[PDB]
């Protein structure tokens, strides 16, 4: 039951990256991650997740 590291890649159509690293539980580290997507739809537009890594990889990707 011991804890993880998530990568979560975020790219905007606005010509601009970000990242951020969430550590947790398989879910409360997955659930905070896109949470964190969601409060960023409402000034971008709709997005995309391609999972990596065994789950430990989260590439986001804005559609704009």
Known sequence: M???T???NL????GSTQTAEFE???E???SEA????????E?????????ADEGYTLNIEFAG
Do not use: Q
């Not at 896109?34 to 739809?41: F, P, S, V």
């Open 34 to 41: 896109y949470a964190y997507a969601d409060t960023l739809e």
């Open 11 to 14: 790219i905007f159509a606005n």
């Open 24 to 26: 947790g539980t398989f």
């Open 43 to 51: 000034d971008n537009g709709e997005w995309t997740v391609d999972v």
């Open 2 to 4: 011991e804890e993880v």
């Open 6 to 8: 998530i990568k979560a």
């Open 28 to 30: 409360e580290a997955t």
